[PDB]
């Protein structure tokens, strides 16, 4: 039975421990998310569109490329508007008709991204600084965020330093759109909503409840390996929530 240690606000192990949820065992496939969003595989010309077939006619200008073309000031002619009347000609969208497969792949991708989050080399490859993090997956005791513990911004920021998230939060401080920093995953039913009010103040860190986990946060830009801070309450439910959907 693999288990993960839980840390207190002080930054040291509280002696307690949690069962490592099974989802972290899922096989890591680096380009699964990119695959879900791909048009035609290994197409380098127009991957999101079926190529235009001119037949015995002459191909329109805008065909075979993604670039906009010059256009005449706006206010039979229908076919002419299509070929040379538009900045962007109409295109045959590349449609992946086997929907259920694609849907299943999204589901697995979520598990695969969760697993990737608990692999230090993948996190560093995504540019997170995690050399100071004591353990992955990183689990904090929910007692440290039970209610108005980290409602204050000073208390939340102090918690991240002691847990080792400091260097990654400060990284962001150099030079909305903050998938670069750590993701705080919490259980709404037990941890509450107060902690969000404290973390929202901090730049870089992102907030999200366990039930509302998506690939945008777990795999920014379609790259697996998000730095995640779990609350003890969140870890326990985590295995049930993924199986629920």
């Amino acid at each position: 039975r693999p288990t993960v240690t839980v840390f207190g606000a002080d930054g040291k192990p509280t002696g307690a421990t949690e069962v490592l949820p099974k989802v972290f065992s899922a096989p890591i496939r680096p380009d699964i998310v990119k695959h879900v969003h791909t048009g035609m595989a290994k197409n380098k010309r127009q991957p999101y569109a079926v190529s235009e077939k001119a037949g015995h006619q002459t191909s329109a200008e805008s065909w075979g490329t993604g670039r906009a073309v010059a256009r005449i000031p706006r206010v039979g002619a229908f076919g002419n508007m299509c070929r040379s009347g538009r900045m962007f000609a109409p295109t045959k969208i590349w449609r992946k008709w086997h929907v259920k497969i694609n849907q299943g792949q999204k589901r697995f991708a979520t598990a695969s991204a969760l697993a990737a989050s608990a692999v230090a080399p993948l996190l560093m490859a995504r540019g997170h600084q995690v050399s100071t993090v004591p353990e992955v997956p990183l689990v904090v005791d929910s007692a440290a965020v039970a209610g108005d513990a980290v409602a204050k911004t000073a208390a939340a920021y102090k918690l991240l330093k002691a847990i080792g998230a400091g260097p990654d939060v400060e990284k962001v401080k150099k030079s909305h759109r903050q998938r670069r920093g750590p993701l705080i995953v919490y259980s709404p039913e037990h941890d509450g909503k107060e902690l969000v009010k404290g973390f929202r103040n901090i730049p870089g860190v992102e907030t999200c409840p366990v039930d509302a986990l998506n690939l945008l946060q777990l795999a920014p830009g379609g790259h697996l390996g998000r730095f995640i801070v779990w609350t003890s309450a969140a870890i326990k439910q985590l295995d049930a929530v993924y199986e629920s959907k």
Partner: protein
């Protein structure tokens, strides 16, 4: 020995886990124990078709999907045995002639779908196991049909745009599609596509605003959110009819899902360039006369990043690559 149907299920699970290589192996062995005369030949060939599509082997995919048709020419077999209408729709897109050949395949696919829809509805008034399940199944089927009609619309605005009854056929397709799936964003997206080419810009905007209102508020993984390639087409429509502000939001979400998408970096950069031109012309009447400069700065960042990913991926859209350069050089000259 083992039942081949179990092998089909195994390969499907493997495919759904992104393990395409092993799926092809298991799907191959499966079909060998089924053959062309087998009960599950259609479903097996369909699966082998899906797999080779995901592999990027289009020519293998065409042969498998074609063989599936020869096993189930009218599509009357249950989806579980014969594969379903999917094989017709893929042959339409994979058609090397395109044009009339694609429409013919699409029509065959639409025919199968319409019959299945009608069958589910008869099964609805018949005492169902679950009314909710059937309505859901009907919805899914009507959406696939709507998307099929839209696919035909796009052939008539490209391959067969020289046809005299091109506009008439498109008008008939979008009326039926809005009838069967008025809640589906792609139908209204396609309505806008037609309108633009009809020089009906305001109605195009109206249609696009409607399609967006059906998904922009959804969570990013919800089945109601249109597929990536469909949202690329959307961005082109949005820049076309001067809704760059909306295009900016759509392009930012897309990059949050795949930041190795050359064409999306370009579209986002171009959308921001166009937006900057407008703000700049209105600069005299605007409150922030310098706002356009920041808008063009981000345009430059998107386009720089486009060329960067362009090189890294060894992209082959030369014309898009050269235009991105022109746009950057242009922004530079104007500071």
């Amino acid at each position: 020995s083992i039942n081949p149907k179990e092998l089909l299920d195994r390969a499907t699970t493997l495919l759904e886990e992104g393990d395409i290589e092993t799926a092809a192996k298991v799907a191959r062995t499966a079909y060998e124990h089924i053959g062309e005369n087998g009960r599950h030949a259609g479903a097996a060939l369909t699966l082998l078709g899906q797999i080779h599509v995901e592999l990027g082997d289009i020519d293998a995919a065409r042969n498998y999907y074609a063989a599936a048709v020869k096993v189930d020419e009218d599509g009357s077999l249950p989806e579980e045995l014969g594969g379903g209408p999917e094989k017709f729709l893929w042959l339409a897109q994979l058609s090397e002639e395109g044009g009339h050949d694609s429409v013919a395949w699409f029509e065959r696919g639409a025919t199968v779908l319409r019959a299945q829809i009608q069958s589910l509805m008869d099964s609805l008034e018949q005492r169902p196991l679950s009314r909710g399940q059937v309505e859901a199944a009907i919805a899914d089927k009507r959406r696939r049909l709507a998307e099929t009609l839209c696919a035909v619309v796009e052939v008539y605005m490209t391959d067969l745009s020289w046809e005299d009854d091109a506009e008439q056929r498109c008008e008939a397709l979008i009326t039926e599609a809005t009838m069967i799936a008025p809640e589906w964003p792609e139908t209204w997206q396609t309505v806008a596509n037609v309108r633009i080419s009809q020089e009906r810009t305001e109605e195009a905007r109206e249609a696009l605003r409607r399609s967006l209102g059906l998904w922009t508020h959804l969570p990013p993984e919800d089945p109601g959110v249109p597929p990536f390639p469909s949202r690329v087409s959307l961005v082109r429509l949005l820049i076309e009819v001067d809704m760059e502000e909306e295009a900016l939001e759509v392009t930012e979400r897309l990059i949050a899902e795949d930041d190795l998408s050359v064409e999306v970096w370009y579209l986002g950069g171009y959308a921001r360039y166009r937006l900057g031109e407008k703000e700049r012309e209105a600069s005299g009447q605007a409150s922030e006369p310098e706002a356009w400069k920041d808008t063009w700065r981000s345009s430059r960042k998107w386009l720089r990043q486009c060329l960067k990913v362009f090189e890294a991926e060894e992209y082959e859209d030369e014309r898009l690559g050269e235009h991105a350069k022109e746009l950057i050089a242009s922004i530079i000259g104007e500071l």
